[PDB]
Amino acid sequence: SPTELTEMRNDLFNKEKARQLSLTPRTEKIEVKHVGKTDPGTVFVMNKNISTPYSCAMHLSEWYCRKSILALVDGQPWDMYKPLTKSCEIKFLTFKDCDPGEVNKAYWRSCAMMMGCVIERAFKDEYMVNLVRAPEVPVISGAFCYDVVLDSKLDEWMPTKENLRSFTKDAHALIYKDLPFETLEVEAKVALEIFQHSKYKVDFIEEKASQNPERIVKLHRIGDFIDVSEGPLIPRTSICFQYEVSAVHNLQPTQPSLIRRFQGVSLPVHLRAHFTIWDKLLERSRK
Amino acid sequence: TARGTPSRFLASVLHNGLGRYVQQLQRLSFSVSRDGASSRGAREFVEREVIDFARRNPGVVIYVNSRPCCVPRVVAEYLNGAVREESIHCKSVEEISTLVQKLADQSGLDVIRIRKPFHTDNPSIQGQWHPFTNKPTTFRGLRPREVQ
Amino acid sequence: AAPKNRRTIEVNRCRRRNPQKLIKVKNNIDVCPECGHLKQKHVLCAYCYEKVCKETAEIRRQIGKQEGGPFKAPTIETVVLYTGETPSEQDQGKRIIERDRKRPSWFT
Amino acid sequence: ISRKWEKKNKIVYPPQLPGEPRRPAEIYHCRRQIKYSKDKMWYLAKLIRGMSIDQALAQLEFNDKKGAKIIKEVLLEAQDMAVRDHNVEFRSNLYIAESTSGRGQCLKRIRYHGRGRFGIMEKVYCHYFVKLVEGPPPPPEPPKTAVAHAKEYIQQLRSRTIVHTL
Amino acid sequence: NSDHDRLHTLVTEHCFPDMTWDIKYKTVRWSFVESLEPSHVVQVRCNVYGQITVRMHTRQTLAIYDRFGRLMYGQEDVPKDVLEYVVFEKQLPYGSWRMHTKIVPPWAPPKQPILKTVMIPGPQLKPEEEYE
Amino acid sequence: VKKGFRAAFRFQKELERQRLLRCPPPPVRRSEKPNWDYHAEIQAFGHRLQENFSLDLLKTAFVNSCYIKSEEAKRQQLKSNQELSEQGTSFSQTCLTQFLEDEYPDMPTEGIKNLVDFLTGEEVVCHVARNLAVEQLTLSEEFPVPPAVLQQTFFAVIGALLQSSGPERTALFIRDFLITQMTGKELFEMWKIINPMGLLVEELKKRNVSAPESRLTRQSGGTTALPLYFVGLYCDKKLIAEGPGETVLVAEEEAARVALRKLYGFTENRRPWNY
Amino acid sequence: ISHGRVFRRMGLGPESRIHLLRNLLTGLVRHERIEAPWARVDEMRGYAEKLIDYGKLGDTNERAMRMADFWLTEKDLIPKLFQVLAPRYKDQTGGYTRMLQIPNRSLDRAKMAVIEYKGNCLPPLPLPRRDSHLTLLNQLLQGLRQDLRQSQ
RNA sequence: ACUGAACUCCUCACACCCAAUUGGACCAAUCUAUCACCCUAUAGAAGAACUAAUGUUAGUAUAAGUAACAUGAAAACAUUCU
Ligand SMILES: [Mg+2]
Ligand SMILES: [Mg+2]
Ligand SMILES: [Mg+2]
Ligand SMILES: [Mg+2]
Ligand SMILES: [Mg+2]
Ligand SMILES: [Mg+2]
Ligand SMILES: [Mg+2]
Ligand SMILES: [Mg+2]
Ligand SMILES: [Mg+2]
Ligand SMILES: [Mg+2]
Ligand SMILES: [Zn+2]
């Protein structure tokens, strides 16, 4: 059953979490220096593989926690809740930076993952849903897209306006729940063990393990929902303020199975858009 | 006054009279002074009446402590855990006897306003009144002005 | 007219704890991107403005030293140059104010 | 005079058992004899009651009242001592559990009136107290909804008894 | 137990503030377990004050809590091996031998890591100042 | 300063009283407070209950195993009440079953078992022991005595009474001190049940009676927020029991409960227990 | 009732208001940047713009010279007004002054404003900059713009 | 017909509802004699008892955070201007 699959996937997730935590026992102090433009020269002695950039923001002030979406640990984007590994240089990226492109990409991926969760838990029990991938599209595209294969029983069914609004209501319920984006660097073996059932996710995991030097893969969980991440994600879902599953377009070249691309659009609390601008964005997010 | 004082409902400790009567008083403690006009009455009570009361109330453990004391006292502890302390300072032998007898016959419940002089666990035998008692029923249970 | 009765503490609390009297929470406070200190949305950052005022005061002290006396306002433009800077082609024909410190990053 | 607020930081609790929730830290700080009316200080205290340390500091930094600067200094001192001495891990993980203004020791002066009469000015001084509790600020008491409020009404209806009878 | 009355006679006045200052308002559960090698004197030197250096390689336990009884240093159960160079001093009429100072060599291993993360603020620059 | 001593003494007494009320000391077993003699207390316990307990048996009943373990641990630096408690619990269960079966022959074995469990449960037995002073005379390693230990001690006392005076006297004791605890208690207040309508259907099937027909007997304020529904269960067009409720479902459930009470003979107006 | 009244009531009267604005404007011409109560700066901004216009009118214009003579108490600034400020803004048609709000005066918590003449040599003020075009919302709006352009 | 008191009856208990005035029984606290010795007893005394005198002294409220008060402008805080 899908509930059993989710339960066992979460069990494996927790097993991997505990395994890594035990592999990193005790407390090793790692020096992380704030290289950001503001509050320069500060140094945090942090618990190795336990503390997070969110903990660094907690030390700094509440404004850093509320405004920082990503961390450039040694020039690489790190999720605000990803444990730090070694002494490094850290700079917090917000939505209003001069070049917030990385933050925008992380937000786009997080919204796509939320859409995937909504899609997987939306349909009725009889129909089977397979989340194939979250294509990485530019923000200029006007909509974050998530690719899903629906059942042959529904290959002739197109979501109605009410169905789309129900999807949005589920996404908003998730946002209200405000679940943190848990992250894990998990070896391809354990990733395949978790996602053995989903062939699409199996092959995506294999592709990622081939791309990276080792077989390390990025697993992400909002709640009870685990997915392979193309990159760093948002800390929490409550960052999202406006969210709208806009359309579902059936990809034209679908001989073997009918792939449907769920297109949606969102805006964080920091970047709220007026009602009319939001409506125009929604209109343009249906292509 | 009642509004400026706690109140309770008439009750027993453990349904003290249903099966058998159990004397609620369980402990008496008389702090008395060998010397002192205050405890002359207490000394006379201990000499003459305490033994008779003790044998009359075998269920009450009575302690007598002769201690330097300017105000002799009797502390009564009941089965329900209540503790009542009464000063016998300058009380005659008869006054002490009456006070001790009242303590023996009394229960551990607080001496506060009692809301009702009665307490029934089964107030109704024929069925507590409700608006539909004494109201006749109608054919097919049709409410007034019902078409069908 | 004099009060006819002492006003009770209950009435006084009702009056002086009213929301109309309570201090309102400000929601236009933000963090300045440049320095990270707190500012209001419509108001200039206090820290950055203090920087600018201090640098302006130094430049104005230099200007006063150059002018040397009241009523000596130049009839030509002014250019501020810091250590390691040389007048440019457009800086020609403009009075030069020399500063002993290096060029501030925010100054341009 | 009383100085119990200062002593309140010297209470040492016994070590907690491993299977016990982590006791949140608590820091009592105060400033005595502030040249400011306690009535005026109370407004700022009430303003910052229940808020996080950072939010309270932000609110006070942009307040025109004189007491705002004093309260900000007191809060900064409380944060510093909480981190240094009370083993508070994060500066920002503090919220104002209690903030009140107390009357200080005042001085009496004479105000000269028009016809050889006078009044007694009081050079008012006030104390200021804060308790900083570690952890995120408690959520604001949500307004009671119609569902719960009608639930209360129905409970009151059910609680009715036949009064003054058997 | 914070028995400062006995600590005064057990340690020198130069050592007492080190013994007791930083530990105020926090419970310590220091305990001793069997030593590893027998304690032996190292050297002695000398209005007149005695001085004896004793090297100890013992095994001990720590559990330092907060005002609120929450652990902040060391496991209470797991013991650690401690190498110390303890220097006693004596008054020379009624004085006795009391701990005077612990010599920590530069090559000593780093002590147990702290439990809580810490921050070390950088220069709090004034407006005119610029970070370097 | 005012010369005098009596006002100062009175004020000190008032300050002490207020301090005690604000910060009452931790509870202490009565054994450790002044004016305590264990032998006199146990004799008075027996005489209060009007029963000729054997003193050694009563002492052995009041002593618990945990107390023995704690005492031995302290001595490092006695017969427990296990068997007496077992005997008392067994006899109490059997005798309560006899009482309840005699009083309510129509009560099913399940109902009788549940009533006995309620009467011998931790809450009721603990209340009875607390108000009978068993807790004061209980020897335990911790205070306040936990409800399990208090119940064990109370049943040990019952077993001691059995071994001293006999089954008849012990049955009288049980009737007096546990059967009285169900006075004023409602059948399903003592025996928690689920799906009373289903249970009633089962009972009628056992009695070879068709399933009852739930029918709306009376109604008020149907469309309001405070409705009253009187629902009656009819057997072959004969009313067996009717019950009120706020919703029709609740009224039907309560009517099923009333029908169960009538069938089992545990109605509110049933014959009171005989003492 | 003050419907349509556009001039604040400042100082001790009309003449005192004019003199206060005159002093503020003289300081503005001398220093190219002035801090003053927000209302006074707002009142004096129009007069600053009008002086720039009069300077544009030319040195040889008698009316402009008289206006400058009145409005600049320190007469050494009149050559400055006619030979630095006006040539500086000869290209512009307006908006010669930049006015911004400043944190309230510590003394009396007055609403403070900084007013400067654009293009001065002094260090630039921390001007409020709009959000970067690379933000999420701005990129989405860029997508809107591109789609609309292509479609129509 | 019923309702209807502090009238009357009923169970129990009884000195326990008049201004000025008058008779009487007790008594808080203090000191002294002698007791007592976690607050007292029998007596002898007396600056021996305060919801009230626009009472006296001290404290703090209310009116009230009100009436009322104050610093000409810019600035390099040199200086200049009104
Ligand atoms: Mg005069
Ligand atoms: Mg004016
Ligand atoms: Mg009548
Ligand atoms: Mg009468
Ligand atoms: Mg007098
Ligand atoms: Mg008085
Ligand atoms: Mg008076
Ligand atoms: Mg006031
Ligand atoms: Mg008024
Ligand atoms: Mg006024
Ligand atoms: Zn800034």
Side-chain angles (χ1 to χ4, degrees):
Chain A
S1 301
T3 182
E4 303 168 7
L5 298 192
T6 60
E7 295 149 15
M8 64 82 69
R9 287 185 171 179
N10 294 320
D11 297 348
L12 293 167
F13 198 91
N14 300 334
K15 288 297 189 309
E16 185 57 24
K17 282 175 61 59
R19 185 267 186 189
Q20 296 186 16
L21 185 62
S22 311
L23 185 76
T24 48
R26 300 177 303 174
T27 51
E28 291 73 23
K29 300 308 192 179
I30 48 170
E31 311 273 332
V32 55
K33 179 191 158 187
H34 192 229
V35 67
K37 185 184 179 189
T38 187
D39 295 350
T42 73
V43 190
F44 304 103
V45 308
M46 287 279 172
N47 294 340
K48 198 169 194 169
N49 287 77
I50 301 161
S51 65
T52 61
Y54 187 72
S55 79
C56 301
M58 283 291 296
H59 278 281
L60 281 172
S61 74
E62 191 185 341
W63 300 90
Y64 285 93
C65 302
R66 300 292 81 86
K67 280 190 186 303
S68 60
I69 296 89
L70 269 192
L72 287 179
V73 167
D74 286 342
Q76 300 303 125
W78 284 63
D79 291 324
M80 293 288 302
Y81 291 122
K82 189 169 177 182
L84 297 166
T85 57
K86 61 183 198 63
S87 164
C88 50
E89 309 286 305
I90 201 164
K91 173 193 299 178
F92 298 103
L93 305 183
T94 80
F95 266 115
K96 294 177 190 176
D97 292 347
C98 294
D99 181 11
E102 288 301 339
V103 178
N104 294 346
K105 292 176 197 168
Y107 186 72
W108 217 245
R109 294 192 207 96
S110 307
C111 289
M113 189 179 176
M114 292 169 49
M115 179 181 265
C117 173
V118 170
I119 294 163
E120 85 171 5
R121 301 208 168 93
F123 304 103
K124 300 153 197 168
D125 299 328
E126 63 278 14
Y127 311 116
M128 187 275 288
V129 58
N130 209 337
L131 314 164
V132 64
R133 194 190 64 264
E136 205 87 347
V137 302
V139 175
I140 296 293
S141 78
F144 59 86
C145 316
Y146 200 79
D147 291 352
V148 178
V149 177
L150 295 190
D151 191 352
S152 63
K153 310 163 193 168
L154 292 183
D155 279 337
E156 71 281 19
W157 162 87
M158 315 304 158
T160 71
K161 293 204 303 177
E162 291 77 3
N163 306 153
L164 288 164
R165 274 192 279 275
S166 84
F167 299 144
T168 76
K169 199 178 189 302
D170 300 346
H172 281 287
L174 183 62
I175 294 165
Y176 181 80
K177 283 173 189 170
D178 177 21
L179 310 172
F181 277 93
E182 301 139 4
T183 72
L184 296 178
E185 288 183 349
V186 177
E187 201 72 350
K189 283 73 171 175
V190 190
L192 300 153
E193 296 155 14
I194 293 174
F195 283 126
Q196 74 293 20
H197 298 298
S198 45
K199 55 176 76 62
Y200 301 108
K201 300 203 176 307
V202 165
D203 56 64
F204 192 70
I205 294 157
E206 294 290 348
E207 294 287 332
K208 276 297 196 175
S210 81
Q211 294 310 313
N212 53 2
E214 310 179 0
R215 322 301 295 176
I216 197 71
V217 178
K218 293 182 180 184
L219 281 293
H220 283 58
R221 183 174 66 170
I222 320 177
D224 297 358
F225 170 62
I226 309 164
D227 179 30
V228 181
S229 81
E230 187 66 26
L233 295 194
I234 298 299
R236 316 185 65 87
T237 60
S238 57
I239 300 297
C240 295
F241 180 69
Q242 288 163 321
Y243 198 108
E244 185 67 25
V245 177
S246 49
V248 181
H249 301 282
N250 291 354
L251 291 183
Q252 311 299 320
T254 55
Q255 306 157 354
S257 55
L258 195 148
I259 309 183
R260 321 179 77 101
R261 170 169 295 181
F262 288 66
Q263 284 192 354
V265 62
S266 182
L267 272 165
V269 297
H270 310 91
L271 296 169
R272 300 155 57 188
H274 184 79
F275 172 87
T276 68
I277 298 164
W278 183 240
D279 272 16
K280 291 167 173 306
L281 286 172
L282 292 182
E283 294 166 5
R284 181 256 192 272
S285 79
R286 292 157 180 163
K287 295 172 175 60
Chain B
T1 67
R3 289 186 78 109
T5 302
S7 61
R8 64 179 180 87
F9 283 107
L10 183 64
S12 49
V13 173
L14 272 182
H15 312 105
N16 189 25
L18 284 183
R20 67 185 62 171
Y21 170 75
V22 177
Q23 187 174 199
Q24 294 305 311
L25 177 70
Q26 61 156 330
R27 203 162 303 110
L28 276 179
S29 307
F30 294 86
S31 58
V32 184
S33 178
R34 290 191 330 119
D35 306 333
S38 54
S39 63
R40 179 187 60 181
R43 281 190 297 273
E44 301 315 317
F45 177 85
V46 169
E47 277 178 278
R48 288 153 41 187
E49 313 286 331
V50 71
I51 296 179
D52 307 71
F53 178 87
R55 62 181 64 267
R56 280 196 314 269
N57 298 106
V60 182
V61 186
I62 304 178
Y63 302 92
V64 182
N65 315 325
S66 294
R67 194 181 56 257
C69 183
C70 283
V71 165
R73 273 173 189 90
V74 60
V75 175
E77 314 191 33
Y78 296 88
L79 289 172
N80 72 337
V83 176
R84 179 170 175 175
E85 165 173 317
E86 286 289 311
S87 63
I88 52 181
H89 171 80
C90 291
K91 278 190 174 55
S92 59
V93 191
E94 52 268 15
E95 287 171 74
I96 294 178
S97 296
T98 60
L99 166 62
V100 170
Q101 188 50 242
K102 182 181 72 58
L103 294 175
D105 292 326
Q106 190 171 357
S107 179
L109 298 170
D110 299 344
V111 193
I112 55 183
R113 184 181 68 90
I114 291 158
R115 299 208 177 190
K116 275 136 75 170
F118 39 73
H119 167 239
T120 53
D121 271 311
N122 296 273
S124 186
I125 297 88
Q126 299 171 357
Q128 184 174 297
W129 180 98
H130 56 73
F132 284 130
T133 57
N134 309 332
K135 271 203 196 320
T137 53
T138 63
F139 185 66
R140 283 191 289 121
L142 288 172
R143 72 185 67 95
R145 242 76 168 182
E146 201 170 358
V147 291
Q148 289 187 350
Chain C
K4 200 80 179 176
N5 283 107
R6 176 181 177 283
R7 277 213 289 209
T8 63
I9 182 59
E10 288 86 28
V11 173
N12 290 335
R13 272 197 219 101
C14 288
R15 177 178 74 259
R16 72 184 57 146
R17 301 194 181 197
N18 199 73
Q20 185 257 345
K21 294 216 190 300
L22 295 187
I23 300 173
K24 292 179 180 178
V25 172
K26 292 182 178 66
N27 48 2
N28 51 10
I29 299 160
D30 211 2
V31 165
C32 170
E34 287 77 359
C35 69
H37 292 77
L38 297 170
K39 72 184 293 295
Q40 282 186 128
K41 286 183 198 306
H42 60 291
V43 180
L44 263 62
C45 182
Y47 184 88
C48 298
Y49 187 59
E50 180 70 358
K51 292 196 324 199
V52 170
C53 294
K54 286 181 68 60
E55 191 53 33
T56 293
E58 288 297 332
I59 288 162
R60 278 169 178 167
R61 286 182 196 93
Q62 294 301 128
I63 279 169
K65 286 164 54 176
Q66 191 142 340
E67 284 184 7
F71 317 121
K72 307 288 283 302
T75 183
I76 202 62
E77 288 279 336
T78 305
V79 177
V80 179
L81 293 182
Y82 292 81
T83 47
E85 288 172 352
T86 303
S88 84
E89 69 282 16
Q90 69 270 16
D91 305 334
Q92 298 305 123
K94 312 169 84 182
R95 74 167 185 173
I96 307 300
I97 305 297
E98 277 290 338
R99 290 283 290 112
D100 289 17
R101 57 161 300 177
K102 55 170 288 298
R103 165 63 58 109
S105 56
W106 42 273
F107 189 99
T108 305
Chain D
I1 57 170
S2 292
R3 295 285 171 271
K4 299 167 74 175
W5 205 258
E6 284 81 335
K7 303 177 182 183
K8 284 190 169 303
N9 278 324
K10 307 179 184 310
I11 60 188
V12 189
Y13 298 80
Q16 281 187 310
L17 313 175
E20 192 178 336
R22 186 178 176 91
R23 176 175 289 105
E26 301 177 339
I27 307 96
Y28 296 81
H29 196 39
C30 54
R31 178 158 301 173
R32 312 274 188 175
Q33 293 296 120
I34 300 158
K35 182 74 207 59
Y36 204 51
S37 179
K38 61 158 169 54
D39 306 287
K40 298 170 183 165
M41 205 79 169
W42 180 90
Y43 285 104
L44 301 166
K46 177 74 166 51
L47 164 74
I48 70 154
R49 282 178 190 172
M51 278 150 45
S52 60
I53 187 68
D54 281 338
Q55 196 193 341
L57 292 170
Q59 292 294 319
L60 291 163
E61 182 175 357
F62 296 99
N63 202 349
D64 287 328
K65 292 187 183 295
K66 173 215 267 187
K69 183 184 181 179
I70 298 138
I71 294 185
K72 193 161 74 66
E73 292 163 1
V74 170
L75 286 180
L76 290 168
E77 290 168 349
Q79 211 182 16
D80 290 349
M81 66 174 51
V83 165
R84 289 182 293 98
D85 315 320
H86 306 275
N87 203 58
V88 168
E89 185 167 28
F90 310 107
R91 294 185 295 170
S92 68
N93 197 36
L94 289 158
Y95 76 93
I96 296 89
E98 306 187 37
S99 77
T100 65
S101 63
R103 197 186 177 266
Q105 294 197 98
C106 299
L107 297 172
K108 289 194 184 67
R109 299 281 173 272
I110 175 158
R111 193 192 179 278
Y112 303 92
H113 279 241
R115 295 221 214 201
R117 286 172 279 204
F118 59 95
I120 311 302
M121 286 163 72
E122 181 182 86
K123 301 305 295 180
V124 63
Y125 292 77
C126 72
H127 304 326
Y128 179 61
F129 315 88
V130 291
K131 173 163 103 166
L132 299 189
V133 174
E134 186 184 19
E141 176 61 37
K144 67 190 319 185
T145 56
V147 170
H149 183 74
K151 204 177 305 307
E152 188 181 6
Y153 177 68
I154 288 173
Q155 281 179 12
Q156 278 170 2
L157 283 187
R158 289 193 197 272
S159 289
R160 286 181 294 176
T161 65
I162 316 179
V163 310
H164 290 148
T165 192
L166 190 79
Chain E
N1 307 320
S2 80
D3 305 336
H4 304 299
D5 180 79
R6 271 81 71 195
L7 278 161
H8 276 116
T9 70
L10 294 156
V11 308
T12 67
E13 284 78 355
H14 170 92
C15 193
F16 194 81
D18 295 331
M19 297 317 291
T20 58
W21 180 234
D22 301 331
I23 197 67
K24 190 68 177 295
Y25 309 126
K26 48 185 73 168
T27 67
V28 60
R29 292 290 178 83
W30 191 100
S31 172
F32 182 67
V33 72
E34 52 87 30
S35 297
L36 295 178
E37 61 86 20
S39 179
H40 64 85
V41 185
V42 167
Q43 72 177 4
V44 298
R45 290 96 66 209
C46 287
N47 206 352
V48 186
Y49 299 137
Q51 188 181 6
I52 304 175
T53 60
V54 192
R55 164 181 190 276
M56 282 86 79
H57 189 273
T58 60
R59 200 166 67 185
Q60 306 175 2
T61 74
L62 287 175
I64 305 174
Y65 296 87
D66 280 326
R67 280 179 52 243
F68 297 96
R70 50 195 200 172
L71 180 64
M72 69 171 178
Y73 194 57
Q75 291 80 18
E76 66 280 355
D77 56 352
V78 180
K80 298 294 134 186
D81 292 333
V82 193
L83 182 146
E84 55 275 18
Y85 293 125
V86 177
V87 190
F88 289 21
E89 193 183 6
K90 185 177 187 295
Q91 180 63 266
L92 279 66
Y94 292 168
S96 166
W97 286 110
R98 309 180 297 172
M99 275 72 79
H100 182 65
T101 306
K102 289 203 288 190
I103 300 169
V104 63
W107 58 268
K111 295 183 289 298
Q112 212 167 349
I114 303 299
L115 282 188
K116 83 188 196 78
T117 62
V118 193
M119 177 188 58
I120 314 164
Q124 303 293 319
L125 297 173
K126 302 173 62 62
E128 79 288 2
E129 309 174 14
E130 289 206 348
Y131 180 67
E132 309 299 333
Chain F
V1 68
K2 305 177 194 175
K3 44 183 190 288
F5 171 89
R6 294 167 93 114
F9 188 79
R10 267 188 81 187
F11 191 72
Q12 290 294 315
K13 295 288 104 176
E14 302 327 310
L15 285 188
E16 195 50 50
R17 272 201 314 98
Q18 287 177 358
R19 183 180 300 107
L20 289 189
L21 289 183
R22 289 187 293 93
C23 296
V28 180
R29 58 192 79 196
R30 185 55 179 76
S31 305
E32 305 322 302
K33 286 207 274 291
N35 301 315
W36 180 257
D37 183 37
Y38 197 89
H39 191 62
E41 292 286 349
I42 202 153
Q43 287 179 279
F45 175 90
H47 290 305
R48 220 178 296 122
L49 301 181
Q50 290 99 11
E51 283 162 346
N52 298 114
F53 290 81
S54 47
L55 272 293
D56 53 355
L57 274 295
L58 200 50
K59 295 222 173 181
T60 45
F62 271 115
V63 60
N64 295 295
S65 66
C66 53
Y67 173 74
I68 300 187
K69 300 290 179 67
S70 70
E71 286 305 293
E72 292 313 301
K74 294 166 189 177
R75 186 187 306 184
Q76 283 172 1
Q77 311 176 3
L78 288 172
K79 195 194 307 300
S80 75
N81 64 359
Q82 192 60 240
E83 76 290 13
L84 276 170
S85 76
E86 283 163 353
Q87 298 168 44
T89 305
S90 302
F91 176 84
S92 69
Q93 277 168 353
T94 56
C95 200
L96 279 172
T97 300
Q98 270 303 128
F99 279 122
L100 297 171
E101 284 172 349
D102 291 351
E103 189 75 19
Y104 318 106
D106 298 339
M107 189 72 73
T109 57
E110 177 58 26
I112 294 286
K113 179 178 73 175
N114 275 295
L115 286 176
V116 171
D117 285 6
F118 166 81
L119 293 184
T120 60
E122 284 189 10
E123 307 186 18
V124 165
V125 175
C126 171
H127 183 75
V128 170
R130 286 212 152 93
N131 302 137
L132 281 188
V134 167
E135 194 182 20
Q136 286 186 343
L137 286 164
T138 291
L139 300 166
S140 78
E141 85 192 1
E142 73 291 32
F143 192 82
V145 172
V149 171
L150 195 61
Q151 184 193 19
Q152 187 180 349
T153 47
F154 181 77
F155 284 125
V157 163
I158 286 188
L161 180 59
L162 184 145
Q163 295 202 12
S164 310
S165 63
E168 283 73 27
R169 285 295 292 266
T170 310
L172 283 172
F173 181 90
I174 294 165
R175 186 204 65 181
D176 295 357
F177 292 113
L178 294 180
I179 287 286
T180 56
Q181 294 301 131
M182 69 199 285
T183 58
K185 298 294 289 184
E186 190 273 330
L187 175 56
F188 309 128
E189 273 181 342
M190 296 183 281
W191 165 24
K192 306 297 187 290
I193 55 162
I194 305 295
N195 192 1
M197 176 56 75
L199 192 152
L200 169 64
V201 164
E202 298 314 300
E203 264 289 334
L204 289 179
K205 281 214 310 300
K206 303 298 150 292
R207 295 162 188 268
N208 293 320
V209 182
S210 177
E213 199 196 346
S214 166
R215 205 156 171 80
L216 190 67
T217 68
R218 292 212 184 95
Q219 180 180 2
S220 176
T223 78
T224 71
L226 310 163
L228 173 63
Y229 294 101
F230 267 87
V231 165
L233 313 180
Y234 281 83
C235 180
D236 312 318
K237 314 297 180 69
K238 180 177 74 66
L239 180 64
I240 74 189
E242 62 168 348
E246 316 91 7
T247 62
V248 182
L249 291 179
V250 170
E252 180 178 355
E253 188 261 334
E254 203 282 332
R257 288 183 183 279
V258 175
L260 287 174
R261 289 180 202 115
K262 283 181 173 183
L263 286 180
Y264 297 170
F266 208 93
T267 56
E268 188 179 339
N269 58 312
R270 76 195 179 275
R271 185 74 65 88
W273 199 279
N274 203 347
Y275 297 101
Chain G
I1 312 165
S2 70
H3 298 340
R5 301 281 185 263
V6 288
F7 297 131
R8 289 174 176 84
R9 300 158 60 179
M10 305 163 31
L12 309 169
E15 191 180 75
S16 184
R17 175 191 162 271
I18 286 299
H19 290 312
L20 278 178
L21 299 170
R22 195 165 67 166
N23 287 344
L24 286 169
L25 189 39
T26 296
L28 178 62
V29 169
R30 171 168 300 283
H31 306 285
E32 307 207 54
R33 182 180 297 165
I34 294 297
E35 299 179 357
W38 188 96
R40 296 172 184 180
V41 171
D42 193 71
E43 194 88 339
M44 178 265 289
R45 194 179 195 184
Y47 292 99
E49 306 269 335
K50 296 262 183 169
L51 287 182
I52 295 300
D53 286 337
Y54 271 100
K56 283 186 185 200
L57 271 183
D59 192 9
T60 65
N61 188 357
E62 66 280 16
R63 197 177 92 269
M65 176 51 65
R66 280 174 54 253
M67 197 69 54
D69 184 20
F70 177 88
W71 274 101
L72 300 175
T73 61
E74 298 144 20
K75 309 302 170 187
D76 66 314
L77 301 171
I78 307 188
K80 181 182 184 172
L81 179 136
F82 280 110
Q83 306 173 31
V84 181
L85 295 174
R88 182 196 299 177
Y89 303 123
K90 64 187 176 56
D91 53 307
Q92 308 186 14
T93 56
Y96 318 119
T97 56
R98 195 200 322 280
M99 171 188 186
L100 297 161
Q101 185 163 349
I102 293 304
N104 287 14
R105 196 198 275 153
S106 59
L107 170 79
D108 50 19
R109 315 307 306 177
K111 196 174 192 288
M112 290 291 286
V114 66
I115 177 163
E116 68 172 5
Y117 268 125
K118 291 185 186 163
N120 56 7
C121 71
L122 304 171
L125 295 171
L127 303 178
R129 284 191 327 279
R130 290 192 161 276
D131 274 12
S132 178
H133 192 71
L134 304 178
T135 60
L136 199 82
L137 170 56
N138 283 303
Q139 291 294 276
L140 291 168
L141 297 183
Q142 183 61 35
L144 287 176
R145 188 208 265 271
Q146 292 169 353
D147 291 331
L148 286 165
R149 183 183 305 181
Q150 295 159 9
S151 297
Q152 303 87 2

